[PDB]
Design a protein around this ligand. Structure first.
Ligand SMILES: Nc1nc2c(ncn2[C@@H]2O[C@H](COP(=O)(O)OP(=O)(O)OP(=O)(O)O)[C@@H](O)[C@H]2O)c(=O)[nH]1
Ligand SMILES: Nc1nc2c(ncn2[C@@H]2O[C@H](COP(=O)(O)OP(=O)(O)OP(=O)(O)O)[C@@H](O)[C@H]2O)c(=O)[nH]1
Ligand SMILES: Nc1nc2c(ncn2[C@@H]2O[C@H](COP(=O)(O)OP(=O)(O)O)[C@@H](O)[C@H]2O)c(=O)[nH]1
Ligand SMILES: Nc1nc2c(ncn2[C@@H]2O[C@H](COP(=O)(O)OP(=O)(O)O)[C@@H](O)[C@H]2O)c(=O)[nH]1
Ligand SMILES: [Mg+2]
Ligand SMILES: [Mg+2]
Lengths: 78, 437, 431, 431, 437
């Protein structure tokens, strides 16, 4: 299923646009008792509904690339 | 480059870590294997994960967390749980004995032989860290691991690192509801150590969360799952300004230095609004004015401490969602014009607002409503001395006839230490009423 | 890894420990042979608390069974769940016990204890990290009050900083079954006080009252009484073996319950107890579970809790619950009757909750009380001892075997001093 | 959540409350086995008023039936809707009542009352609101009088601000059937005056008369009487249950009934009552219903209210009806029989309407008449007591169990001052 | 923009609010689930809902009225019947205990445990506004929740909101027909707290509406629903000028300043015309003059007192439907030319006429016909002095030998309170007669 024919999508990545690519969110236990409440944080997977509709994450490629090399220094002869 | 190492100490620390790393992974779209999903070949422009996870040489995500608990049950459950592939194996550090609600046992015994390994893992994380904005330590004042080992760990990070911030999320005991018995002793003894080695000392009380869940969420039977999800939402809304961009970004140093007037009032008070449920939240606008007016209420506090018996010294407000600065400023103006909120005389301009475009990411199966606006409000009210007055009352009426003290004096705790901690906290609350008046 | 070494002593101790092992092996999913036909992995995650690995996957309990006569050892070995034990820690003597404290503490039992300590050192250094020892003596026999207290003294002197948990069955005014029972009880409690981390004293009369009122049973025999005591044992040490929510081990209970070191005589109770027909009409949740803990009819000590003040109360709950509900219930009962509670320990109920219920019932709880109402039972035992001792009745056996009356004098003096220590923190006020 | 604990004292109380549970379980849709076999949603909406809830959706009554003879437990348990009760709510003794107030109050009822209060306290504060305590008993006998009045005294001491209803079967002179009835009634009305909040007195003579000349049954053997009493109970308690247009709960009745605190003796009446031969011939309009309601021959008290004066009058109607028909009829009865109403209280009639009729007819009404004609029973009981207390008749059968004559004289004085109190407002003036 | 927040206290209040909101939803075209059905996009404006119904971000019409009772029966009936999703969950506040026709019980011991929550909900509803116009309170003077808690609620509302209008709709006890015994006591204790400390109070009996339903509607055995519908029609005709449009609108604060002369005379009486069934409505010539002269008929008032034995002090006459403002003046002239209708001397002009364009709606399953023009004639006069004289007679007769006073003393209220309230209402009667002469 898509979160586009069902919701509003604003520049959301493909990772959240298809919530079916999420695996490992089940981990079904043994026989249904011995069901400690602490392992209830690995509950039901994110789906088309409980997914972010907006992803406003900054990108620091330019800043990181300039920060590794270093800022400008007055080096010359004039 | 902005990166925060989280240290989760105690059983409360490990459960907070579970319910907060679940929210972090589910917000950044990382499955519990630690594996980043299909990015359509080219990875693209996305580096919000860098504040909590690191790109290894495979495309995986190992979190910047150190889970420490002396008792090898709650952390072995995480090692056998659904998030077993997330954490590095030499990050869920455990011992073989317990500290058993004993500050002396957690500080001068078995908790001591593990602090070297914890510091070595912290050193490795800081070495692989480029820019360390601040450590983020989650524990409880119940006792044992959460007080003695947490105090020792804070002292050791203070003496080795220094400078860099150390935010603290401490679970605080209630006026009436309590689990352990030597909780006033363990909480008095740890204030002496969390005073001069903490930069912010956020306090959460369980009874306030119970009342909040029973009143606003229509759940008659709350538990630690809901408690730690609320605390996870608090810390996620605090730290979201790093990972997700916003107008008026407020990062860790900024709301550290715009929240504390003096280097003895560094014990803020969190509040989340809305904490409403979905069936109720169907019938409101959830406007900015509404979610600000339903945030200074004494019924929505997080500590069981009504701020009417005190003055607000500082107030940071982190808005998270589709909020507009015009409505933020109108809400601030209305809050200032209302008379019941008494701000202190030497701070006419105390409000630090921070906007983030990202709405709060709902966790499926949770009890909270799923809405496009939220506020995490960090007050610095002078009313916080009420809890410490009740703490002194309980400590005095236990220490009048030396109850429960033989365990401490056998495992450490020269008998003047209790009196020293009592004197320090009494002088501190004297300082708090001094800055209140 | 935590672990508990079991040391059973006496006929009562051997029977009740056999029942304890055959109920916790069913709790962990262990055959009478000793093979795991379980159904989950949480049973094998912490199986090493009570069992030692053998070749192939067989599990051998870490229990040392002690007696002075062959007797109950042969009965237990012939009985079901008797083939699970190690055959090399069935140590016994060929003599008689004589239900005599002097015979159990100074005669031929004083060289059987060397072999018992050799076996215990073997089972203790064949390990990694001892949480401690538990012992289940009888308090009124020659082996429970003899061999048992001698074991406690030797273990305390040899390992000085490990948790000792002695359960023990205290004597009763009615239902006596022994004539020198006050002598044995008074001579044994003196060794219990200075050498044991904590005791969970249980009374046969209170157990019989529990059976005749709550769990009807018509004929209560000893299997159901040992079942109740074993359920109390498995309830109190369940957080060591099963994970879940906020948990408490034996050292945490010790540091939360006893305020001052000679005040570790506890008043236990198991309370999902419902009749066979009353099970259908019963509702099972935290409030009625709480009141069945705080019911004086469901207490395994004969003393009335209304005749004193609770110092501390431990509540070890089991099952998927709302701990908001259990904390609200503890605060509610404290605020309901604050009269039977000490003012100088505010909110004196240590609460723990585990998420693994026992087999059968859905929701469980175990009550432990460090009440000041045990002083009336101790005063009663001292009254019987002094009434028997003013005429020196039944003393020629003890003196002829060899114990001076100074030993009985110190036993009675420590008896009365402990009674006074329990008495002062009953009318002692805050300010 | 407003809810009553129901307690039945004596054989008469046990049977007359068993019929009450048998009729309200049928009204709420509960089967004999305790499950909800109901069609409407409205039936399982206010079931918390009288029922608890157990595992598996099983609803048990909140009944704490108490007697002191074992035959009545067999008679209440073997009958229909008898297995629905919780077996823990069956506390009783193996002795004999003796039809003795002294036995039921001081000697053998005082031993049982501790356990009775324990079970009553459990079933009362295992709750959230606890509006009502409804004790049901007969005056004149043994445990119905002495045990019931002692239970009333202890419960009113424990809960001083909760509503106390007592359905009391006061003795009548024509029926008699017991020679110590004046002693028991005169000695129990002392405790019924100073403690209870609303006491509804029911005459067996009036029940026999209403079975003879209204229901027109040839042999009204033993169940038609307590069926009528149970119908009256449901009528007076229905407002805490199925919602109506104008409801009035127990406090709403009690505030508007008593003008003065010791005037809480009421004469009840439930009159949509017709014989089976005339049920096809009569209509069931509101005027017919209220005229046969205010008819004195459909009253459950032998006092003729024409020889007296109404202090207050209640009318609890059941059925979907018109409230400017019921109101104009309540005004019309005052304007017609204005002489029999007190002139210093305008609008003596309090009217409540619920829209859900009882099982059977589509309209019904319950009448509660506080009148100054109820003194006839009280004067006759006082006369029969003072005709027996002169020559010390049957008095050693109370002094041996232990009472002085001062208690009897003070009981007779408290009888006579209450009779004079009712006579005072029988013969008075507005100004 | 023009808000009319309503509070419905008492069982009569909750039932009359059920009928009132049924009428509001039916005349605003809102289905009971909150949405607006039948292709809402037709029409450009239709902002008339923003007086009674709010509007969330998703666009739901959420009403502005708090239903408060102490017993949960009628409130739970509302929560389970039809209008279930329309109201907010924290909008139908209920209690455990009942007030039981007892003003002292509902005012001093039970009323104070729910007053903070109802004032917080009124706080939230008033904060969800853009400038409030007027509170509309609905209760009965029979006693209990409708009298004592209503009085305490009005006290705290007057403390909190300064001079906002607080219009009462009181169900006053009728002369002969009444359903309790302590109603004179409750009315005497309530008039003290609603006289000097509340705004204009419309007051209606029950047997006047009973007689009107018997005669005009030709219906012989109906119930309280066919009274609540008529009072809902009256209140709709009152506060329809805020929502709708028409010539010479009458604002809610302009009703008071142009009706009530002195700030103690604020007890007018209402009369709705023409109440009629369909068969009788088909047979006449419903017109402005006819409905005007039928308003002043003494057999058509909703208060059982003859206005022929009193003086007409002022009259605000509100019209709905196809009404021209010339037939209004033609009817006013032919009323003022009549000698039997008597006006007070200091009042040459005694009429405020207002006109609203949109005709009154017809409820399905009702008994009123499809009327084209209607009047809610609201007159302040001196005829209610007879009714309060009769109630003084009843209260003095019952208080002659202190009947039923032991309760009010038992939960706590001094015996002098009754005498104070009685002399207050006697001074009020003196005030009415000296104004009349
Ligand atoms: N909010 C919240 N509080 C918790 C949680 N778990 C434990 N606590 C708090 O922790 C207190 C008990 O002490 P702990 O912090 O658990 O002690 P510990 O971490 O187990 O360390 P030891 O006592 O040495 O075993 C209680 O009073 C709780 O308030 C949790 O999951 N959420
Ligand atoms: N007009 C009208 N009056 C009503 C209605 N319902 C109740 N009343 C009046 O209310 C009076 C009784 O008071 P209630 O309103 O029923 O009681 P309350 O205000 O809920 O407070 P309590 O007495 O504690 O229940 C009666 O005399 C009736 O005249 C109604 O639906 N319409
Ligand atoms: N609970 C329980 N108590 C027992 C059992 N057998 C004996 N007892 C109690 O133990 C007491 C006797 O102690 P005993 O075992 O003979 O001591 P020993 O002679 O040294 O072995 C008696 O008072 C019994 O009440 C049993 O199977 N279960
Ligand atoms: N109406 C009615 N009266 C009863 C019933 N049972 C007994 N009585 C009357 O109660 C009196 C005896 O009371 P009793 O039941 O012996 O009281 P107890 O001794 O406390 O059990 C007799 O005179 C009967 O007339 C009953 O089921 N219905
Ligand atoms: Mg721990
Ligand atoms: Mg009501």
């Amino acid at each position: 299923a898509k979160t586009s024919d069902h919701y509003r999508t604003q520049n959301l990545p493909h990772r959240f646009e298809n919530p079916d690519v999420f695996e490992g969110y089940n981990h079904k236990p043994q026989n249904p008792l011995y069901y400690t409440t602490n392992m209830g944080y690995g509950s039901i997977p994110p789906t088309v509904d409980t997914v972010p509709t907006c992803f406003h994450a900054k990108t620091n490629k330019f800043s990181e690339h300039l920060g590794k090399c270093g800022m400008y220094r007055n080096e010359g002869l004039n | 480059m902005r990166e925060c190492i989280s240290i989760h100490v105690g059983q409360a620390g490990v459960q907070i870590g579970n319910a907060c790393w679940e929210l972090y992974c589910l917000e950044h779209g990382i499955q519990p294997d630690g594996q980043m999903p299909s990015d359509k070949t080219i990875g693209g422009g996305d580096d919000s994960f860098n504040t909590f996870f690191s790109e290894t040489g495979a495309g995986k995500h190992v979190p910047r967390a150190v889970f420490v608990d002396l008792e090898p049950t709650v952390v072995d459950e995480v090692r056998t749980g659904t998030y077993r592939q997330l954490f590095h194996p030499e990050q869920l550090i455990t011992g073989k004995e317990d500290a058993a609600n004993n500050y002396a046992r957690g500080h001068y015994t078995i908790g001591k032989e593990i602090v070297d390994l914890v510091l070595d893992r912290i050193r490795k994380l800081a070495d692989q860290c480029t820019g360390l904005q601040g450590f983020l330590i989650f524990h409880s004042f119940g006792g044992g691991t959460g007080s003695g080992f947490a105090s020792l760990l804070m002292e050791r990070l203070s003496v080795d690192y220094g400078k860099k911030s150390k935010l603290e999320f401490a679970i605080y005991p209630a006026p009436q509801i309590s689990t352990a018995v030597v909780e006033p002793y363990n909480t008095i003894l740890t204030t002496h150590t969390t005073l001069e080695h903490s930069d912010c000392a956020f306090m959460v009380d369980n009874e306030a969360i119970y009342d909040i869940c029973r009143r606003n969420l229509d759940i008659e039977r709350p538990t630690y799952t809901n408690l730690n999800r609320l605390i996870a939402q608090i810390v996620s809304s605090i730290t979201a300004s790093l990972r997700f961009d916003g107008a008026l970004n407020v990062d860790l140093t900024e709301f550290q230095t715009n929240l504390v007037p003096y280097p003895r009032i560094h014990f803020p008070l969190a509040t989340y609004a809305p904490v409403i449920s979905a069936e109720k939240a169907y019938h409101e606008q959830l406007s900015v004015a509404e979610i600000t007016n339903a945030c200074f209420e004494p019924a929505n506090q997080m500590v069981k401490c009504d701020p009417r018996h005190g003055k607000y010294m500082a107030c940071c407000m982190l808005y998270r969602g589709d909020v507009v600065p015009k409505d933020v400023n109108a809400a601030i103006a209305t809050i200032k014009t209302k008379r019941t909120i008494q701000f202190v005389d030497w701070c006419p301009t105390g409000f630090k607002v921070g906007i983030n475009y990202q709405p709060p990411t709902v966790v499926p199966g949770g009890d909270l409503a799923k809405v496009q606006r939220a506020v995490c409000m960090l007050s610095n009210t002078t009313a916080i001395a009420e809890a410490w007055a009740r703490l002194d009352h309980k400590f005095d009426l236990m220490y009048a006839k030396r109850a429960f003290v033989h365990w401490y004096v056998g495992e450490g705790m020269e008998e003047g230490e209790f009196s020293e901690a009592r004197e320090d906290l009494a002088a501190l609350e004297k300082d708090y009423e001094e800055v209140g008046v | 890894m935590r672990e508990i070494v079991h040391m059973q002593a006496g006929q009562c101790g051997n029977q009740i420990g056999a029942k304890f092992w055959e109920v916790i092996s069913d709790e962990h999913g262990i055959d009478p042979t000793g093979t795991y036909h379980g159904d989950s992995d949480l049973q094998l995650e912490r199986i090493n608390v009570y069992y030692n690995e053998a070749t192939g996957g067989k599990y051998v309990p870490r229990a040392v069974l002690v007696d002075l006569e062959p007797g109950t050892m042969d009965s237990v070995r012939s009985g079901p769940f008797g083939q699970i034990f190690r055959p090399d820690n069935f140590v016994f003597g060929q003599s008689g016990a004589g239900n005599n404290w002097a015979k159990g503490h100074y005669t031929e039992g004083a060289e059987l204890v060397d072999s018992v300590l050799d076996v215990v050192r073997k089972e203790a250094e064949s390990c990694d990290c001892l949480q401690g020892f538990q012992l289940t003596h009888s308090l009124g026999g020659g082996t429970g009050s003899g061999m048992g207290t001698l074991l406690i003294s030797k273990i305390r002197e040899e390992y000085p900083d490990r948790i000792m948990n002695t359960f023990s069955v205290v004597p009763s005014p009615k239902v006596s079954d022994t004539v020198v029972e006050p002598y044995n009880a008074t001579l044994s409690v003196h060794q219990l006080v200075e050498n044991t981390d904590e005791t969970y004293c249980i009374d046969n009369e209170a157990l019989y009252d529990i059976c005749f009122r709550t769990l009807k049973l018509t004929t209560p025999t000893y299997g159901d009484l040992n079942h109740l005591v074993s359920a109390t044992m498995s309830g109190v040490t369940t957080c060591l073996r099963f994970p879940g929510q906020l948990n408490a081990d034996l050292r945490k209970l010790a540091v939360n319950m006893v305020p001052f070191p000679r005040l570790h005589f506890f008043m236990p109770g198991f309370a999902p107890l419902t009749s066979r027909g009353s099970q259908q009409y019963r509702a099972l949740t935290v409030p009625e579970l709480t009141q069945q803990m705080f019911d004086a009819k469901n207490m395994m000590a004969a003393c009335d809790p209304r005749h004193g003040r609770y110092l501390t109360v431990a509540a070890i709950f089991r099952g998927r619950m709302s701990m908001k509900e259990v904390d609200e219930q503890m605060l509610n009962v404290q605020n309901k009757n604050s009269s039977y509670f000490v003012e100088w320990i505010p909110n004196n109920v240590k609460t723990a909750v585990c998420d693994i219920p026992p087999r059968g019932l859905k929701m469980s709880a175990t009550f432990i009380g460090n009440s000041t109402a045990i002083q009336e039972l101790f005063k009663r035992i001292s009254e019987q001892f002094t009434a028997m001792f003013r005429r020196k009745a039944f003393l020629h056996w003890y003196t002829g075997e060899g114990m001076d009356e100074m030993e009985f004098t110190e036993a009675e003096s420590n008896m009365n001093d402990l009674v006074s220590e329990y008495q002062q923190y009953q009318d002692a006020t805050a300010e």
